[PDB]
Design a protein around this ligand. Structure first.
Ligand SMILES: [Ca+2]
Ligand SMILES: [Ca+2]
Ligand SMILES: [Ca+2]
Ligand SMILES: [Ca+2]
Ligand SMILES: [Ca+2]
Ligand SMILES: [Ca+2]
Length: 579
């Protein structure tokens, strides 16, 4: 700085910038690289509060503490004032950051380490991994004294003392024979009387088991829905609402058939087995397509199997990881894109399920952390596509929807449980070569698919990659990305994740090798996971694609939400308009 005679010799960054008072210039002279130099400049603007004295600046350049509001904080704390783990700073999962590393890299916002880029009154604050807390302040040690930026109050787990622990058994038989006194639904709204006029009118043509003496107003499921217990509510005709019960983890994954002979070698493939498929919905109200499910005229009528089907055996060479490749045109007539009318922006994906219904995930429709409230006139569908970028009027079609039904058990705040949404097509869709629905595995068929050794298939166009993985370098693909993933073992699916994953979701993907971000984070949100059943040469869609932990950090497969518990659910919707 001063003593201009000094402005001849080689100056040490310390000797010219600290104790004296240097600008960017003498610093640069000392260093000669604008990257770390402007790291130093970012500190300097931050150390504007740390210009004097010496230590004040030595520590400020050290980076081990937050200056009050923490604009200087360059540490690595991943806990909020309550200890909540912070979200990815660069990405918007699960809440959109107003000011981020693209905006203020001068605060050096790392992956999830606690920061303060906007100089808000909260001090060091981070968007949190838990969707419940959009922004929570981080307790960061104070520069110069044994203090922190905000009070630390970790939310430690509650003891099992003040709460009366229920020894009551979990509800068996999917709540068909439940014998408690439950009187609260998902919203807490009480039910009506069973013998009411609306309830009788709606359940006149509903398949109920008369063995259950339907009690006064308790949650009863005489239709044997595999999702849980439900009861009628007032309002619009035909409506209902599921209740809240502590169900057993009676997942189909560990259900081994009581007829599976102990001779599991030289397995008999489809051997002239005319495996009829039993339609479960009402064809008058659900529409056609269930009968023609799983039969591709280009494949089933041509006796052709896709060049990606030859991998369907899990008996490949050591099951080595294979990256995805482009599929044949017309091999995915059901793949649909959920799009925004204004602006025309890529939002989500799905698969066509019938001639009148479109099934997607519940998170794609309602994600309030992104100011999203999507109604009938703010959603559109693009069907029969091979490329997104082109306008394929002859093959791809653009359609609107009429009514939207969301699942009552929608829990996006924690784990995207019951990621289910059903929207009725506004215009009838004509069956052709590039338009087709899919089958829906029941309990036993899906059990056979899981335990007999068959791979599933997920189709998507990489919307999740643009939305959630903010790394610049992997753009939105132009071709449909199709990935074959077998089933994952349940302790493997549960142990490596901290979030309580419900039995309505499951993992799909190979073991993650060290040193890479896996292939489970490819495709659109809401995609289908389809598996081919050897009995009838057809394809059954197990569920819906949602967000996966494999994107944000390594070591995770794709997490997808089941649909086999929703059959009895789906009918309950159409009977509202099926009169
Ligand atoms: Ca000087
Ligand atoms: Ca100088
Ligand atoms: Ca000097
Ligand atoms: Ca100099
Ligand atoms: Ca000079
Ligand atoms: Ca010195």
């Amino acid at each position: 700085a001063n003593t201009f005679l000094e402005e001849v010799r080689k100056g040490n960054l310390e000797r010219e910038c600290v104790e004296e008072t240097c600008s960017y210039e003498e610093a640069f002279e000392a260093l000669e690289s604008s990257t770390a130099t402007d790291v130093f400049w970012a500190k300097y603007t931050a150390c504007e509060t740390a210009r004097t004295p010496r230590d004040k600046l030595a520590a400020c350049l050290e980076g081990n503490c937050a200056e009050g509001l923490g604009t200087n904080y360059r540490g690595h704390v991943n806990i909020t004032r309550s200890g909540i783990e912070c979200q990815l700073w660069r990405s918007r999962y699960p809440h959109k950051p107003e000011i981020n590393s693209t905006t203020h890299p001068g605060a050096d916002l790392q992956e999830n380490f606690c920061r303060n880029p906007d100089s808000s009154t909260t001090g060091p604050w981070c968007y949190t991994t838990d969707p419940t807390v959009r922004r929570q302040e981080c307790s960061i040690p104070v520069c110069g004294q044994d203090q922190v930026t905000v009070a630390m109050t970790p939310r430690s787990e509650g003891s099992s003392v003040n709460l009366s622990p229920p020894l009551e058994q979990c509800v068996p038989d999917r709540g068909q024979q439940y014998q408690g006194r439950l009187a609260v639904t998902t919203h807490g709204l009480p039910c009506l009387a069973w013998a009411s006029a609306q309830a009788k009118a709606l359940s006149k043509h509903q398949d109920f088991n008369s063995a259950v003496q339907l009690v006064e107003n308790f949650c009863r499921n005489p239709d044997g829905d595999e999702e849980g217990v439900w009861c009628y509510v007032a309002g619009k005709p035909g409506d209902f609402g599921y209740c809240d019960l502590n169900y057993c983890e009676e997942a189909v994954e560990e259900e081994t058939g009581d007829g599976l002979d102990e001779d599991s070698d030289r397995a008999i493939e489809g051997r002239t087995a005319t495996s009829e498929y039993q339609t479960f919905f009402n064809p008058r109200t659900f529409g056609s397509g269930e009968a023609d499910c799983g039969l591709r005229p280009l494949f089933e009528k041509k006796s052709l199997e896709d060049k990606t089907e030859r991998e369907l055996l899990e008996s490949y060479i050591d099951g080595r990881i294979v990256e995805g490749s482009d599929a044949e045109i017309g091999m995915s007539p059901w793949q649909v894109m959920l799009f925004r009318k204004s602006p025309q922006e890529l939002l989500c994906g799905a698969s066509l399920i019938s001639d009148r219904w479109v099934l997607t995930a519940a998170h794609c429709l309602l994600y309030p952390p992104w100011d999203k409230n999507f109604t009938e006139n703010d959603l559109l569908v693009r069907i029969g596509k091979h490329s997104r970028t082109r306008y394929e009027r002859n093959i791809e079609k653009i359609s609107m929807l009429e009514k939207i039904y969301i699942h009552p058990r929608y829990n996006w705040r924690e784990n995207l449980d019951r990621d289910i949404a059903l929207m009725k097509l506004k215009k009838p869709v004509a069956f052709s070569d590039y338009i087709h629905p899919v089958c829906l595995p029941d309990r036993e068929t899906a059990a056979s698919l899981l335990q007999a050794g068959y791979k599933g298939r997920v189709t998507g166009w990489g919307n999740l990659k643009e939305t959630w993985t903010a790394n610049v370098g992997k753009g939105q693909p132009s071709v449909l990305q199709v990935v074959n993933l077998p089933i994952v073992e349940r302790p493997v699916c549960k142990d490596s994740t901290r979030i309580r994953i419900t039995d309505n979701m499951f993992c799909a993907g190979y073991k993650p090798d060290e040193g890479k971000r896996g292939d489970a984070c490819e495709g659109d949100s809401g995609g289908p996971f389809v598996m081919k059943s050897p009995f009838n040469n057809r394809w059954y869609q197990m569920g819906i694609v949602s967000w996966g932990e494999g994107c944000d950090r390594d070591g995770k497969y794709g997490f997808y939400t089941h649909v086999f518990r929703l059959k009895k659910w789906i009918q309950k919707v159409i009977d509202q308009f099926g009169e």
